Amino acid sequence: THSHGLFKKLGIPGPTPLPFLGNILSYHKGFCMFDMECHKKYGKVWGFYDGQQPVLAITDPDMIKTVLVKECYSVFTNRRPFGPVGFMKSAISIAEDEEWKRLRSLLSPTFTSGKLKEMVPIIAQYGDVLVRNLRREAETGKPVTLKDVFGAYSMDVITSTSFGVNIDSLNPFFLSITVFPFLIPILEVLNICVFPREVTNFLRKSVKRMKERVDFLQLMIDSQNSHKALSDLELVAQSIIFIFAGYETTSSVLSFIMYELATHPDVQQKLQEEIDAVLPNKAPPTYDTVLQMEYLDMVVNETLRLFPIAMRLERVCKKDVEINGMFIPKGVVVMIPSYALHRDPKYWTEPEKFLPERFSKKNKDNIDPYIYTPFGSGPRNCIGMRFALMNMKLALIRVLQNFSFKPCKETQIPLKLSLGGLLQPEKPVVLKVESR
Amino acid sequence: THSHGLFKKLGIPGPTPLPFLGNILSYHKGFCMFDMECHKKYGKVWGFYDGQQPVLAITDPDMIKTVLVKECYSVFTNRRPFGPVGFMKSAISIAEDEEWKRLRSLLSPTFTSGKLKEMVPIIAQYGDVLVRNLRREAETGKPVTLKDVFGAYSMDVITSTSFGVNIDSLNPFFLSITVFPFLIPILEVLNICVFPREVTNFLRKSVKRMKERVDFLQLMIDSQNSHKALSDLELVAQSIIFIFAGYETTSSVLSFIMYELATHPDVQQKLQEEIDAVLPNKAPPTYDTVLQMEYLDMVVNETLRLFPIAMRLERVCKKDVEINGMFIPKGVVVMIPSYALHRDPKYWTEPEKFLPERFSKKNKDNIDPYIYTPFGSGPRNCIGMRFALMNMKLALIRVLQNFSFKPCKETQIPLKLSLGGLLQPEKPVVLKVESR
Ligand SMILES: CC(C)(C)OC(=O)N[C@@H](CS[C@@H](Cc1cccc2ccccc12)C(=O)NCc1cccnc1)Cc1cccc2ccccc12
Ligand SMILES: CC(C)(C)OC(=O)N[C@@H](CS[C@@H](Cc1cccc2ccccc12)C(=O)NCc1cccnc1)Cc1cccc2ccccc12
Ligand code: HEM
Ligand code: HEM
């Protein structure tokens, strides 16, 4: 624990680290509470230790823009390593430096405006499965688990948009990794993975069994026809990454939104009127009608403020720099506390209140893009942003065109956040559903 | 690799060990071929190294009886450790010394003659599910996968006999452990288990959800009313052990038997006649009618000779001894090569031929019980022997009372054994089924 002297030397403040553990015992309220409390206790900049790993928090918009954008390629190219990963080191969200630049370049036209447009008339089928599955679980007095039917929809979107598989989807130790990150090399030589070898072996062969537009796999197969050419396993590993995000992020966010709509009935009505004015007669939403719904966008934007599911953004400082008058020595992890900045009263009036009008064009400009960052920023931001927003908005239009949402006896009010690792709710979201 | 001098010193012969790996590269033909070849090359006694771990093979019946029986409690009490195990160190097949003696004593009356008898009229229901599931997959030209419908039956026997759950069941790195057994302590502090924490968490709570004769769980719950008293988690971990054996061993053996019957049509007819003489009119088999069928027993006995699914028996020598005129120093693993002894021509004429008459009472006596040992011997033998035999025999009577079994184009003839770890076949067993 010789490394625990770094921040005292640099004159950067923070909580005093315990030997070996660093500051990790403070994760007992979750990343988010620790960050918020640190943000209060110390200010625009502070430091702590994940084990022996020094981590510097920054909250200055300029500094954040310097890290996330200005010096991305040169200094702050990669994220904190987190093995053992195996054959998935070749996945874009994990790869680094030159190998990452290769994959970012190769996989970016997958997510264009125009390819997303080709995906709309296809994403459109499973909202109608989603509604008919909601019909059954609503025609009778029986509260619904959103993450069940949102996940089943998110999955149906994934299998389709990623492989063409059109299915009706009714058919804990990481802590030791920070105290023992020296044990990651060890688990790598033991073939131990954070997956099982079965889910991936399922797909390693499944990919070659189809077989053989517009799913991500074809899009990537087409790109194998500046840099080199995507290889076969490299493509399987990207599939797995895409499947993670589009299933768990999409449906989890969709649950925070139905919760907010159900606990704020005015905002639900105001939005149901908009959907009916743009799409009268319950007209099927399209790419452009979706981008036309402003209140819908404000709802989505404000929900991501309260529940930024990344919570933090992170870049490893790959060599001594002096960003914005501050020396940052190589190997430090630079961290942006999204959740805490999103709930910072120095930028957001009533920051725990769910107030979509913050994102009205009347007020959307008093909002610093390096304070509100649910999808990252600069060259390593969420490659899947536009798809994610489109994917979700398509769900809400078709669901709010048919149903209204009420709190139950079991509805957790107020929603506790996962005190643990990922930004989920404690009890699952359950509401009453009713048909218009 | 200072430990690799042990067998040269003791003047005990064997294959020369490579540094660090020991003799493990020889597992490329599988345990069995290495043992058979060692048995030939060197004789009644030889030695090798799993990494730095010295292992002594013995094939003398007296010596085997000394290890397995005479000096079991005193010297040869436990098996080779094989973590990481977690909360399952408390499972009988894994526990050692005093803790094992406690569990062997507490769990033995579960498997009496009389408790097995109470299980017959209950095991009897799922042979009739097995037959009706075989009916559908046979009424039309379509070969059957035995391990599918034998496993589904073995499972239905398990869930019932172990928890009362009556369900119709149509509803790779270990190598590093021997070169790196020093890494087992490491994986233990990382909570890494050979299970997932989900299968067991499934059961840790499931056990307490029922709720609350004659299943194993009740039998064990009753025994919590010389030694101490079985605890709550100790009981969950025994459930998991029982479920392993009774599912995978039972159905795998049942596949070697249907294979032998289908590839030896006389023995299939001779057995079908016996079942019909003891149980005319397809009378439902009972505990006693099953113990009456001698040819059936001979079939089972001979199949376990060709496919002893343990392959080896193993005991750790817990202190210097001199069994049968031979010094054995503490820490050596003593190993009995079942598979190789079962296929040794010095005891078995035509040992690769499937000849049940070796177990006719006319000849069953020319058979040394420390050469043929499919269930172990002495105080640590298979606690589940009588249940296993009963369980399987019940399946064959009801299945051979209705169906006959023929080889297909895809039937692997001759059966290759799993060249890898466990004693399974290479391609799965598939046969034609037909209704009498
Ligand atoms: C243990 C800890 C929480 C510290 O680490 C993670 O367990 N897993 C993060 C890193 S990778 C991935 C998800 C994933 C989970 C479990 C095992 C994996 C094994 C190999 C590769 C990826 C695996 C992923 O990126 N899926 C796309 C995504 C997810 C969320 C939002 N958008 C896109 C997950 C993570 C969370 C928040 C922001 C992230 C930004 C870039 C990369 C990962 C990010
Ligand atoms: C890797 C290697 C092949 C060397 O080790 C094993 O992977 N697993 C043997 C040891 S324990 C168990 C099966 C089991 C598998 C995987 C993970 C486990 C984790 C915790 C506890 C048990 C686990 C078991 O005993 N189930 C009852 C049984 C099985 C077979 C015949 N009768 C009874 C399996 C084994 C094989 C042959 C004979 C055995 C005798 C005593 C104990 C175990 C024996
Ligand atoms: C509500 C949904 C989502 C949210 C809120 C979200 C947010 C984020 C954030 C904050 C990051 C890190 C940005 C940074 O480090 O600067 C990220 C990265 C990433 N996301 Fe998303 N994401 C979502 C959905 C998706 C989807 C649907 C995909 C589909 C492919 C996806 C693919 C990725 C990838 C590939 C990366 C890493 C980019 C790179 O390393 O080059 N995400 N996401
Ligand atoms: C065809 C089926 C089976 C065969 C061939 C078989 C064989 C064996 C063998 C060879 C051993 C090691 C014996 C020794 O070390 O001396 C063993 C141990 C064991 N078996 Fe079985 N077995 C079978 C089924 C079962 C079943 C159904 C159970 C159900 C509970 C079971 C429970 C156990 C236990 C608990 C042990 C360890 C005994 C102890 O350590 O005290 N086995 N088996």
Closest alpha carbon to A328 in A74, A56, A16:
A56
CA atoms within 13 A on the CB side of B371: 16
Residue whose C-alpha is closest to residue A269's, from A295, A289, A292: A295
Of the candidates A235, A198, A229, A201, the residue with the CA atom closest to the CA atom of residue A215: A235
Q: Are B375 and B399 in contact (CB under 8 A)?
A: no
C-beta of residue B230 within 8 angstroms of C-beta of residue B223: yes
- Residue B214, number of CB atoms within 10 A of its CB: 15
Q: Which residues of A touch B186 (CB under 8 A)?
A: 183, 186
Structural contact between residues B430 and B144, judged by C-beta atoms closer than 8 angstroms: yes
Instruction: Tell me how far apart the alpha carbons of residues B170 and A347 are, in angstroms, rounded to a whole number.
Output: 58
Q: Which CATH number does the domain housing residue A266 bear?
A: 1.10.630.10
Residue B260, CA distances (Å) to A275, A302, B257, B395, B434 in order: 68, 68, 5, 15, 16
Residues with CB under 6 A from ligand 4: B 92-93, 104, 241-242, 245-246, 249-250, 253, 309-310, 313, 374-377, 380-384, 387-388
A407's enclosing H/E stretch is strand A403-407
Q: Which residues contact A288 (CB under 8 A, 6 or more apart)?
A: none
Distance CA B148, CA A353 (A): 56
Indicate the residue of A183, A196, A197 with minimum beta-carbon distance to B186.
A183
B69: left (phi over 0), alpha (psi -120 to 50) or beta: alpha
Experimental technique? X-ray
For residue B195, give the amino acid letter.
F
Nearest chain A CA: its distance from B200 CA (Å): 15
Strand partners, A8: none
DSSP-assigned letters across all residues of A79-135: -------GGGGGSTTT--THHHHHHHHHHGGGG-HHHHHHHHHHHHHHHHHHHHHHH
Distance between CA atoms of residues B133 and B131, nearest Å: 5
- Distance, CA of A297 to CA of A303 (rounded, Å): 10
Across-strand partners of A57? A46, A335
Reading the block at residue A199, the tokens are 């889910």
All residues of chain A having their beta carbon less than 8 Å from the beta carbon of residue B172 are 191, 197
For A307, the token pair is: 């529940």
Facing residue for A173 by CB, picked from B180, B186, B191: B191
- Between chain A and chain B, the number of residue pairs with CB atoms below 8 A apart is 31
In angstroms, the Cα distances linking B433 to A362, B296, B404, B405, B407 are 76, 20, 6, 5, 9
User: How many residues are present in chain A?
Assistant: 436
**CB neighbour list of residue B78: distance below 8 Å, 6 or more residues apart:** B96, B97, B100, B315, B316, B318
Q: How far apart are CA B285 and CA B278, in angstroms?
A: 9
Cα-trace Rg, chain A = 22
Q: What is A128-159 written as a DSSP string?
A: HHHHHHHHHTTSSS--EEHHHHHHHHHHHHHH
Q: Is A123:A390 a contact under the CB 8 Å cutoff?
A: yes
Q: How many CB atoms lie within 10 A of CB A29?
A: 12
Residue A270 DSSP SS3: helix
Omega within 30 of 0 (cis) for the link into B414: yes
Task: Match 């090359």 to its residue by tokens.
Answer: B41
> Whose CA is closest to A274, among A360, A208, A213?
A360
Residues annotated within a binding site of B: 382
HSE-up of residue A395 (Cα within 13 Å, Cβ side): 27
* Helix, strand counts (H, E) of chain A: 17, 9
Nearest partner of A325 among A44, A121, A110, A81, judged by Cα: A44
d(CA A127, CA A254): 13
**Gyration radius of chain B over CA positions:** 22
Tell me if B401 sits within 8 A of B279, measured CB to CB. Answer: yes
Mention every residue, 6+ apart, whose C-beta is less than 8 A from residue A90.
A99, A103, A233, A234, A237
- The residues after which chain B has a C–N gap greater than 2.5 Å are 171, 212, 225
State the distance from the centre of ligand 2 to the C-alpha of B231, rounded, in angstroms: 22
In Å, how far are A131, B70, B209, B328, B336 from B315, measured between CA atoms?
Answer: 62, 13, 37, 12, 9
Rounded CA-CA distance A363/A132 in Å is: 38
Q: Amino acid identity, residue A424?
A: Q
> Tokens 């798809």 belong to which residue?
A387
Task: Name residue A423's amino acid.
Answer: L
Among candidate residues B125, B136, B129, the one with its CA nearest the CA of residue B152: B129
What's at A176, amino acid-wise?
Answer: S
Closest CA of chain B from A186, distance in Å: 8
Q: Please name the residue whose Cα sits nearest to atom 12 of ligand 1.
A: A241
Buried (b) or exposed (e) across B151-190, using 16+ Cβ within 10 A?
bbbbbbbbbbbbbeeeeebeeeeeebbbbbbebeebbeeb
The rounded distance, in Å, linking the Cα atoms of A269 and A253 is 20
Cα B13 to Cα B46: distance, rounded to the nearest angstrom:
5
Sheet of B45-50, strand order: B45-50, B53-58, B333-336, B313-316
Beta carbons of B134 and B399 less than 8 angstroms apart? yes
Question: What residues of B are in contact with residue A183 (Cβ under 8 Å)?
Answer: 186, 190
When CB atoms are compared, the residue of A173, A186, A191 closest to B173 is A191
Residue to mutate (ligand 1; options A180, A244, A333; most atoms within 8 A of CB): A244
Whats the size of chain B, residue-wise?
Answer: 436
Which residues in chain B have Cβ-Cβ distances shorter than 8 Å to A190? Answer: 173, 176, 180, 183, 187
Q: Per the CB < 8 Å rule, is A190 touching B172?
A: no
Calculate how close chain A gets to B244, using CA atoms only, in Å.
19
Cβ–Cβ gap B186/A191 under 8 Å: no
Q: Indicate which ligand has the atom closest to the C-alpha of B314.
A: 4
What are the binding residues of B for heme? 382
- The answer to whether B38 and B14 have CB atoms below 8 angstroms apart is yes
Q: Cα dist. A139→A128, A170, A395, A428, B24 in Å? A: 16, 18, 20, 21, 64
Residues A373 and A338: their CA atoms lie apart, in Å, by 7
Strand order in the sheet with A53-58: A45-50, A53-58, A333-336, A313-316
**Dist. CA B337–CA B42, nearest whole Å:** 14
Mark the binding-site residues of A, compressed into ranges. 382
Q: Is the previous residue joined to B352 through a cis bond, with omega within 30 degrees of 0?
A: no
Chain A residues touching residue B197 (CB < 8 angstroms): 172
Exposed/middle/buried for residue A115 (C-beta within 10 Å: 0-12, 13-18, 19+):
middle
> Is residue A429 within 8 Å of residue A307, measured between CB atoms?
no
SS3 A362: coil
The single-letter DSSP state of residue A357 is: G
DSSP at A3 = G
The closest residue, in CA terms, to atom 43 on ligand 3 is A382
- Neighbouring CB atoms inside 10 A of B318's CB total 16
Contacts of B51 in chain A (CB under 8 A): none
Pick from A21, A55, A19: nearest CA to A38 = A55
The three-state secondary structure class of A328 is strand
Distances (CA, A) of A198 to A162, A193, A206: 19, 11, 12
**Distant-in-sequence, close-in-space partners of A261: CB < 8 Å, separation ≥ 6:** A267, A268, A271, A299, A400, A405
Which residue is it, tokens 């249907």?
B258
Secondary element (H or E) of residue A49: strand A45-50
Strands (E), A283-345: 313-316, 321-323, 326-328, 333-336
Question: From the CA of A427, how far away is ligand 1's center (Å)?
Answer: 22
Torsion sign across C-alpha atoms A288, A150, A371, A373? negative
Residue range(s) defining the domain that contains residue A176: 1-436
Q: What is the CA(B429)–ligand 2 centre distance, in A?
A: 23
Token couple for B404: 């006959």
Contact B299, B356 (CB under 8 A): yes
> Is residue A136 packed enough to be buried (19+ CB in 10 Å), middle (13-18) or exposed (0-12)?
exposed
Collect all residues with Cβ–Cβ distance below 8 Å to A382 and sequence separation of at least 6.
A375, A376, A388
Query: Which residue's structure tokens are 């809400």?
Result: A396
What sign has the CA pseudo-torsion B12, B13, B15, B19? positive
Here the tokens at position B159 are 């869930």
Whether B397 is in the pocket of ligand 2, judged by its Cβ within 6 Å, is: no
> How far apart, in Å, are the Cα atoms of B302 and each of B251, B261, B264, B364?
17, 11, 13, 11
Strands A333-336 and A53-58: parallel
Torsion of CA A204, A206, A211, A213, to 10 degrees: -90
Contact B342, B306 (CB under 8 A): yes
With beta carbons less than 8 A apart as the criterion, state whether B79 and B314 touch: yes
Whether omega before B84 lies within 30 degrees of 0, making that bond cis, reads yes
Give yes or no for a contact between A328 and A383, defined as CB atoms under 8 angstroms apart: no
- C-alpha to C-alpha distance for B310 and B79, rounded to whole angstroms: 13
Separation of alpha carbons B209 and B145, rounded Å: 34
* Binding-site annotation, residues of A for heme: 382
Structure token pair of residue A312: 């933090």
Nearest CA, atom 38, ligand 1: A310
Distance separating alpha carbons of residues A421 and B419, to the nearest angstrom: 43
CA A142/CA A148 separation, integer angstroms: 14
H or E stretch covering A276: helix A265-278
Pocket (CB within 6 angstroms of ligand 3):
A 92-93, 104, 241-242, 245-246, 249-250, 253, 309-310, 313, 374-377, 380-384, 387-388
Nearest CA in chain B to A187: B187
- C-alpha span between B142 and A277 (Å, rounded): 58
3 state SS for chain B: CCHHHHHHHCCCCCCCCECCCECHHHHHHHHHHHHHHHHHHHCCEEEEEECCEEEEEECCHHHHHHHHHHCCCCCCCECCCCCCCHHHHHCCCCCCCHHHHHHHHHHHHHHCHHHHHHHHHHHHHHHHHHHHHHHHCCCCCCCEEHHHHHHHHHHHHHHHHHHCCCCCCCCCCHHHHHHCHHHHHHHHHCCCCCCCHHHHHHHHHHHHHCCCCCCHHHHHHHHCCCCCCCCHHHHHHHHHHHHHHHHHHHHHHHHHHHHHHHHCHHHHHHHHHHHHHHCHHHCCCCHHHHHHCHHHHHHHHHHHHHCCCCCCEEEECCCCEEECCEEECCCCEEEECHHHHHCCCCCCCCCCCCCHHHHCCCCCCCCCCCCCCCCCCHHHCCCCHHHHHHHHHHHHHHHHCCEEEEECCCCCCCCCECCCCCCCECCCCEEEEEEC
Tell if the CB–CB gap between B176 and A190 is shorter than 8 Å.
yes
Cβ neighbours of A86 in B, within 8 Å:
none
Helix A98-107 vs helix A232-244: angle between axes, to the nearest 10 degrees?
70
Q: Is there a contact between B247 and B303 (Cβ–Cβ < 8 Å)?
A: no
Task: Tell me the nearest-neighbour CA distance from A84 into chain B, angstroms.
Answer: 13
Give the separation between CA B260 and CA A174, rounded to whole angstroms. 49
> Which of B187, B194, B197 should we substitute to test contact with A (largest number of A Cβ atoms within 10 Å)?
B187
**Chain B: closest CA distance from residue A73 (Å):** 35
Of A400, A401, A410, A402, the closest CA to residue A432 belongs to A410
Residue whose token pair is 């189809």: A210
Backbone angles phi, psi at B195, to 5 degrees: -85, 180
Pairwise CA distance, residues B200 & B88, whole Å = 10
Burial, B412: exposed, middle or buried (Cβ in 10 Å; 0-12, 13-18, 19+)? middle
Q: Do residues B329 and B7 make contact, with C-beta atoms less than 8 angstroms apart?
A: no
Backbone angles phi, psi at A432, to 5 degrees: -85, 140
Min Cα distance B182 → chain A (Å) is 11
Residues 6+ apart with CB under 8 A from A422: A309
Indicate which atom in ligand 1 lies nearest the CA of residue A309: 37
* Planar angle of CA A229, A231, A232, nearest 5 degrees: 150
Q: Which atom number of ligand 1 is nearest to the Cα of residue A93? A: 42
Instruction: Give the Å distance between the CA of A50 and the centre of ligand 1.
Output: 18
**Under a CB-based contact definition with an 8 Å cutoff, are residues A47 and A55 in contact?**
yes
Token duo for residue B115: 């408790």
Other C-beta atoms closer than 10 Å to the C-beta of A11 total: 7
Number of domains in chain A: 1
Which residues make beta-bridge pairs with A425? A417
Q: What is the rounded distance in angstroms from the CA atom of residue B302 to the CA atom of residue B313?
A: 19
Question: In sequence order, which residues have a C-beta less than 8 Å from that of residue A318 and are 6 or more positions away?
Answer: A75, A76, A77, A78, A330
